[PDB]
Design a protein around this ligand. Structure first.
Ligand SMILES: [K+]
Ligand SMILES: [K+]
Ligand SMILES: [K+]
Ligand SMILES: [K+]
Ligand SMILES: [K+]
Ligand SMILES: [Mg+2]
Ligand SMILES: [Mg+2]
Ligand SMILES: [Mg+2]
Ligand SMILES: [Mg+2]
Ligand SMILES: [Mg+2]
Ligand SMILES: [Mg+2]
Ligand SMILES: [Mg+2]
Ligand SMILES: [Mg+2]
Ligand SMILES: [Mg+2]
Ligand SMILES: [Mg+2]
Ligand SMILES: [Mg+2]
Ligand SMILES: [Mg+2]
Ligand SMILES: [Mg+2]
Ligand SMILES: [Mg+2]
Ligand SMILES: [Mg+2]
Ligand SMILES: [Mg+2]
Ligand SMILES: [Mg+2]
Ligand SMILES: [Mg+2]
Ligand SMILES: [Mg+2]
Ligand SMILES: [Mg+2]
Ligand SMILES: [Mg+2]
Ligand SMILES: [Mg+2]
Ligand SMILES: [Mg+2]
Ligand SMILES: [Mg+2]
Ligand SMILES: [Mg+2]
Ligand SMILES: [Mg+2]
Ligand SMILES: [Mg+2]
Ligand SMILES: [Mg+2]
Ligand SMILES: [Mg+2]
Ligand SMILES: [Mg+2]
Ligand SMILES: [Mg+2]
Ligand SMILES: [Mg+2]
Ligand SMILES: [Mg+2]
Ligand SMILES: [Mg+2]
Ligand SMILES: [Mg+2]
Ligand SMILES: [Mg+2]
Ligand SMILES: [Mg+2]
Ligand SMILES: [Mg+2]
Ligand SMILES: [Mg+2]
Ligand SMILES: [Mg+2]
Ligand SMILES: [Mg+2]
Ligand SMILES: [Mg+2]
Ligand SMILES: [Mg+2]
Ligand SMILES: [Mg+2]
Ligand SMILES: [Mg+2]
Ligand SMILES: [Mg+2]
Ligand SMILES: [Mg+2]
Ligand SMILES: [Mg+2]
Ligand SMILES: [Mg+2]
Ligand SMILES: [Mg+2]
Ligand SMILES: [Mg+2]
Ligand SMILES: [Mg+2]
Ligand SMILES: [Mg+2]
Ligand SMILES: [Mg+2]
Ligand SMILES: [Mg+2]
Ligand SMILES: [Mg+2]
Ligand SMILES: [Mg+2]
Ligand SMILES: [Mg+2]
Ligand SMILES: [Mg+2]
Ligand SMILES: [Mg+2]
Ligand SMILES: [Mg+2]
Ligand SMILES: [Mg+2]
Ligand SMILES: [Mg+2]
Ligand SMILES: [Mg+2]
Ligand SMILES: [Mg+2]
Ligand SMILES: [Mg+2]
Ligand SMILES: [Mg+2]
Ligand SMILES: [Mg+2]
Ligand SMILES: [Mg+2]
Ligand SMILES: [Mg+2]
Ligand SMILES: [Mg+2]
Ligand SMILES: [Mg+2]
Ligand SMILES: [Mg+2]
Ligand SMILES: [Mg+2]
Ligand SMILES: [Mg+2]
Ligand SMILES: [Mg+2]
Ligand SMILES: [Mg+2]
Ligand SMILES: [Mg+2]
Ligand SMILES: [Mg+2]
Ligand SMILES: [Mg+2]
Ligand SMILES: [Mg+2]
Ligand SMILES: [Mg+2]
Ligand SMILES: [Mg+2]
Ligand SMILES: [Mg+2]
Ligand SMILES: [Mg+2]
Ligand SMILES: [Mg+2]
Ligand SMILES: [Mg+2]
Ligand SMILES: [Mg+2]
Ligand SMILES: [Mg+2]
Ligand SMILES: [Mg+2]
Ligand SMILES: [Mg+2]
Ligand SMILES: [Mg+2]
Ligand SMILES: [Mg+2]
Ligand SMILES: [Mg+2]
Ligand SMILES: [Mg+2]
Ligand SMILES: [Mg+2]
Ligand SMILES: [Mg+2]
Ligand SMILES: [Mg+2]
Ligand SMILES: [Mg+2]
Ligand SMILES: [Mg+2]
Ligand SMILES: [Mg+2]
Ligand SMILES: [Mg+2]
Ligand SMILES: [Mg+2]
Ligand SMILES: [Mg+2]
Ligand SMILES: [Mg+2]
Ligand SMILES: [Mg+2]
Ligand SMILES: [Mg+2]
Ligand SMILES: [Mg+2]
Ligand SMILES: [Mg+2]
Ligand SMILES: [Mg+2]
Ligand SMILES: [Mg+2]
Ligand SMILES: [Mg+2]
Ligand SMILES: [Mg+2]
Ligand SMILES: [Mg+2]
Ligand SMILES: [Mg+2]
Ligand SMILES: [Mg+2]
Lengths: 45, 77, 102, 92, 60
RNA sequence: UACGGUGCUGAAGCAACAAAUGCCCUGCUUCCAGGAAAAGCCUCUAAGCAUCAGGUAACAUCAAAUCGUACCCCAAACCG
RNA sequence: UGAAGGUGUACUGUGAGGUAUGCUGGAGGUAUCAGAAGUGCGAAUGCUGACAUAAGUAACGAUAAAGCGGGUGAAAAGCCCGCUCGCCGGAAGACCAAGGGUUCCUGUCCAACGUUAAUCGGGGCAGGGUGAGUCGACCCCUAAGGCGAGGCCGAAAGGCGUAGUCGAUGGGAAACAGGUUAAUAUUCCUGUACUUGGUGUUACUGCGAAGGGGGGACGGAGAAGGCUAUGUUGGCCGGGCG
RNA sequence: AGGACCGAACCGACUAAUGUCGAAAAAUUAGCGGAUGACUUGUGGCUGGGGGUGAAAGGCCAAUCAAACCGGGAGAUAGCU
RNA sequence: UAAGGUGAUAUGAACCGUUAUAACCGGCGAUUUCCGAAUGGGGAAACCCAGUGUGUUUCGACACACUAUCAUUAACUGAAUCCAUAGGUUAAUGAGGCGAACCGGGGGAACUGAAACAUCUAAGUACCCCGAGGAAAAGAAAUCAACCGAGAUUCCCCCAGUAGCGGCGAGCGAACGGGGAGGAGCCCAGAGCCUGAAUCAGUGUGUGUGUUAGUGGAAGCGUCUGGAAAGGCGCGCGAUACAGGGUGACAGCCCCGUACACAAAAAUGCACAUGCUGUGAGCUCGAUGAGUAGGGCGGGACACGUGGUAUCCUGUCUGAAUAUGGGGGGACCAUCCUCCAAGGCUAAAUACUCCUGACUGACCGAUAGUGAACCAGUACCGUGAGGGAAAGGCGAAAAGAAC
């Protein structure tokens, strides 16, 4: 009966994507953490 | 930003102590203004965002002496 | 500085084939020689379609540790330890006790 | 005209049914090419290496089939195949 | 080979690169893909022999 | 006929009538709640330059690169 | 010439426990007296794993419905082909976008997966399959909005914003039938098209903007007229004489 | 002409039964209201936590709301079990 | 250095060598797709779209180079008004981002404790932000002491849970003085004779040398038991080497090693001779840091909560004297003692481990130890930030079971 997740690759990437994070101050800290934890998927792409 | 050109007076912080000593963080902004100073040497007006004490420094020394120091630090006028 | 090597008459010190002589086939990177007519293991080799397919038991010359063998002297007539020296310009090996040269 | 690099395009001649049917019955050749390799570059390569007359080159990119075994997944590499339609002077 | 290729002319050194590319590399790369080659070692040594020459034409 | 389909040949191929929520219609009538923008497209001249460069036709020739193209899509393949 | 661990037995101490030994195990163990502790668990709706219970019980996911024959194969209610029967048909049909991402198609294999069986499969394992000047994206244009040189403002981070530059859900060049593979087609092949560029010749010739003007360029409802997609009838055609 | 009328798509959710370890963490069946407008819907934007948004119920802000979620202060504190 | 190699899961294939241009390990080179500060413009990271100049070409075209913003910097142009300044082009030049703690600055909570709670505490802690460096900061007295004199900072131990502070509750809590670690001192607010002599900051350059490849590197047997000997058993035999690890059961002597002795063409990390673009000595006379010290108001820092409150920092409003002078000595004042602010630099002791080697554990031994002994920050969960598993051992050797 309709759900929270209604996927869209444009919105996904615009919202959470690498260029969306790397833009901001806190975004560049988000990546700096994932890199420190040593993850494969840094961001969705 | 609220920073005098001459003195480097910037907005320091501190408490706002009541009668009952209820501390509450506040700011102490300096008395900044825009003012046009007649530079006799170069025969033109110069705008500086100085504080009220700065004006008395410019009264004490020559505006040339202040614009010597302002140019030395790497500011603009 | 490999003491035991390719074309060398060795004798086995320890193992089921204790006191048996043979020439080395090929020493490996792991540190395990293979000597002719020594560690004969009856492998059940399967008749694989590609190439030859004998289909039966076969006595393979399995590997043995380098430390378990030793070079034969052919003078005193028993196992012997190896050294290294500089005869002329080059480096060469030699025997300990009856100190000659290979 | 662009020596050396022309040789670094054409990977292999593709073998299949669709590759066979297009040899005899439509005068073309299928072949695998380097991931870039423009339709000019492939034509120019065929015109030198195979040294035969070319009508036109059609091109498409095959995707990597995700293969798995034991435990770990494994995406195959992508690659570009080129349907090269030859002219009336042909052989291979 | 490197020592003998080091004593060669700059324009002459291209011909060997283009000879390594024209025949040899491409020919073996196709010939291997078609299934007309047991001798797969020739793919390797030629690829190194290219690199050798392409490094040796960086003298200035 | 591997019994799946391949090859061959192939007559007529009309009028009437009914008819959309399709199109003419980004039209016409009207009502007020008064109904994006900006390029391509046409046109006008500024700064310049005339034996040129440019513009208009007619023909010839060359080019049109790269990516997606399978399959599901009111669903057993998406969201639960 | 059998350690720890496991498992039994027979003694022994007031108790925590000790001692000796048959089986298993196949390599470590540790007297004594000291020293140090992650030092002893049945409970915390304790934590993790394994295994019970209800129990071979409920349920097997729409009340659209199956039946018989022949084939395949070890085996067929469920697979394949056949003849009936039934259900959807403004969908339970056929094409797109979004989103999935090989599920497509061929060969072979049923351990698991499928709420049963399985020769079948959106399951496993190999191989194959996605062809564009015209369709869509990219590209030229801009809306909402985003970013934003200088700039203004702000303890710092940063906020706003101009010139700009992005940003489609909108505007902007042109292809349709027909055929074909196991799987692609307005993309390949037969036929007939059109478009927008570049370069050369010939004959003419005032062209020229980041600038002006035109257009692009526009709501709701309503009404009628004219048409076609589409159907329907007759005619023509081939078959039929049940 | 109409926040007109009846009535499918579409939008909603009044009654009843069913279901309540469900087919389903809000549905099905039979009826039910709106259905040219204060309508509905796709795509893309903007608004962010004492903040948003709200034809106002303390409703809604990712199955969580009289102050979201994740991480940190942090082993908070517990005269209680 | 070297007789075997072509990394592993993992055999197979096809070839290179063998007293030495195989393989391997080093040093310095070349190569270094695309994204990413990303930097030609853009963008949904790993994509799209360009511009200007060079050489070539057979029309089709490629090829390599350069073009971000900003800061200091010169050059040339440049306005509203005459030169003007703003402003606009090019070359030179550095910055930009990332990484674990440590450190200096700018901001800065709350739970909690007080058996409630507002002062207070937690605490200038958590956190956020900026800026460094191998450490950083601090620093040569306008210091602190008691008529004795000490002589920059930093850290450790005391002094001392003392003196003080405090709803005088909770709590917080010094200094002087003494032991040590450690040592070090100078420039500018300028003139004479005289000048390269002390001093460092670079270049080449020397040995004592050490660092990234290394090489050598001692000495065991006969028996018995067992699948297998290092084991029991008997004589040995080396030790500047019985640290340690392997090998078919516990190895000083089978092998790796170990002490121990020697290693480097290059890249060097260094410390002394050291020619030297370049830098300034001895000594006269004279100067000795103003919108500053201090004060009024409001805050903060000092153990010190405005209190009788010294002292430092300041937002605001003010304002001295300037060596026949001024600060400090814990309200304040007078003689004595003390120092010279408002300008600067500065090594070591101290903090710290993302990281590359040794070496040790009354540390763990797969529910432990890192979340992670295993292809784990993986699978899987979540829109996202983020959360986050389970999963070790055949044997001595695959001899992994022909038929
Ligand atoms: K018609
Ligand atoms: K706390
Ligand atoms: K652009
Ligand atoms: K030795
Ligand atoms: K001064
Ligand atoms: Mg979900
Ligand atoms: Mg969005
Ligand atoms: Mg407080
Ligand atoms: Mg500046
Ligand atoms: Mg294509
Ligand atoms: Mg590939
Ligand atoms: Mg591949
Ligand atoms: Mg790959
Ligand atoms: Mg591959
Ligand atoms: Mg109309
Ligand atoms: Mg029209
Ligand atoms: Mg299709
Ligand atoms: Mg539909
Ligand atoms: Mg359908
Ligand atoms: Mg469904
Ligand atoms: Mg034990
Ligand atoms: Mg015991
Ligand atoms: Mg005991
Ligand atoms: Mg006792
Ligand atoms: Mg315990
Ligand atoms: Mg228990
Ligand atoms: Mg108990
Ligand atoms: Mg309970
Ligand atoms: Mg459990
Ligand atoms: Mg059970
Ligand atoms: Mg029952
Ligand atoms: Mg029953
Ligand atoms: Mg039942
Ligand atoms: Mg049921
Ligand atoms: Mg049923
Ligand atoms: Mg049947
Ligand atoms: Mg049935
Ligand atoms: Mg059935
Ligand atoms: Mg049937
Ligand atoms: Mg029906
Ligand atoms: Mg698959
Ligand atoms: Mg299928
Ligand atoms: Mg299949
Ligand atoms: Mg079966
Ligand atoms: Mg089954
Ligand atoms: Mg199920
Ligand atoms: Mg399948
Ligand atoms: Mg074509
Ligand atoms: Mg379109
Ligand atoms: Mg786009
Ligand atoms: Mg706007
Ligand atoms: Mg700016
Ligand atoms: Mg600029
Ligand atoms: Mg600037
Ligand atoms: Mg533009
Ligand atoms: Mg645009
Ligand atoms: Mg669109
Ligand atoms: Mg888009
Ligand atoms: Mg689009
Ligand atoms: Mg048209
Ligand atoms: Mg199809
Ligand atoms: Mg065509
Ligand atoms: Mg209208
Ligand atoms: Mg109208
Ligand atoms: Mg009829
Ligand atoms: Mg008829
Ligand atoms: Mg008839
Ligand atoms: Mg007839
Ligand atoms: Mg109505
Ligand atoms: Mg009704
Ligand atoms: Mg509602
Ligand atoms: Mg029931
Ligand atoms: Mg009804
Ligand atoms: Mg209704
Ligand atoms: Mg009604
Ligand atoms: Mg009504
Ligand atoms: Mg929306
Ligand atoms: Mg936003
Ligand atoms: Mg509302
Ligand atoms: Mg209420
Ligand atoms: Mg509620
Ligand atoms: Mg709250
Ligand atoms: Mg709450
Ligand atoms: Mg707790
Ligand atoms: Mg509490
Ligand atoms: Mg380079
Ligand atoms: Mg770029
Ligand atoms: Mg950029
Ligand atoms: Mg470049
Ligand atoms: Mg600039
Ligand atoms: Mg400038
Ligand atoms: Mg930096
Ligand atoms: Mg930074
Ligand atoms: Mg502060
Ligand atoms: Mg409090
Ligand atoms: Mg409180
Ligand atoms: Mg309490
Ligand atoms: Mg405090
Ligand atoms: Mg140090
Ligand atoms: Mg404190
Ligand atoms: Mg050695
Ligand atoms: Mg013995
Ligand atoms: Mg012995
Ligand atoms: Mg054993
Ligand atoms: Mg040396
Ligand atoms: Mg040297
Ligand atoms: Mg002074
Ligand atoms: Mg003062
Ligand atoms: Mg005072
Ligand atoms: Mg205080
Ligand atoms: Mg005083
Ligand atoms: Mg003072
Ligand atoms: Mg006093
Ligand atoms: Mg001083
Ligand atoms: Mg230092
Ligand atoms: Mg130091
Ligand atoms: Mg110990
Ligand atoms: Mg574990
Ligand atoms: Mg376990
Ligand atoms: Mg265990
Ligand atoms: Mg083992």
């Amino acid at each position: 009966m309709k759900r929270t997740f209604q996927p869209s690759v444009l919105k996904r990437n615009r919202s959470h994507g690498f260029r969306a994070r790397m833009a901001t101050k806190n975004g560049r800290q988000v990546l700096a953490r994932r890199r420190a934890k040593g993850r494969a998927r840094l961001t969705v792409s | 930003s609220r920073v005098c050109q001459v003195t480097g007076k910037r907005p320091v912080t501190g408490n706002n102590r009541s009668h009952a000593l209820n501390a509450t963080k506040r700011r102490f902004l300096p008395n900044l203004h825009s003012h046009r100073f007649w530079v006799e040497s170069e025969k033109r007006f110069v705008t500086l965002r100085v504080s009220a004490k700065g004006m008395r420094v410019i009264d004490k020394k020559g505006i040339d002496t202040v614009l010597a120091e302002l140019r030395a630090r790497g500011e603009k006028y | 500085a490999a003491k035991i090597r390719r074309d060398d008459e060795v004798i086995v010190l320890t193992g089921k084939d204790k006191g048996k002589r043979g020439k080395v086939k090929n020493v490996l990177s792991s540190g395990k020689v293979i000597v002719e007519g020594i560690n004969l293991v009856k492998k059940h080799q399967k008749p694989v379609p590609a190439l030859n397919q004998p289909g039966g038991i076969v006595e393979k010359e399995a590997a043995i540790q380098v430390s378990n063998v030793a070079i034969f002297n052919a003078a005193t007539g028993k196992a012997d330890r190896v050294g290294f020296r500089f005869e002329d310009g080059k480096k060469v090996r030699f025997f300990k006790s009856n100190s000659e040269t290979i | 005209i662009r020596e050396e690099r022309l040789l670094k395009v054409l990977r292999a001649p593709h073998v299949s049914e669709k590759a066979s049917t297009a040899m005899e019955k439509s005068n073309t050749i299928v072949l695998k090419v380097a991931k870039d390799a423009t339709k000019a570059e492939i034509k120019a390569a065929v015109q030198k290496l195979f040294e035969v007359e070319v009508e036109v080159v059609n091109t498409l990119v095959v995707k990597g089939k995700v293969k798995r075994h034991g435990q770990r997944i494994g995406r195959r590499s992508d690659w570009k195949k080129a349907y090269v339609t030859l002219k009336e002077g042909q052989n291979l | 080979m490197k020592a003998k290729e080091l004593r060669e002319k700059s324009v002459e050194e291209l011909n060997t690169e283009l000879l390594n590319l024209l025949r040899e590399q491409f020919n073996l790369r196709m010939q291997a893909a078609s299934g007309q080659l047991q001798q797969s070692h020739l793919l390797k040594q030629v690829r190194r022999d290219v690199a050798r020459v392409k490094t040796l034409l960086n003298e200035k």
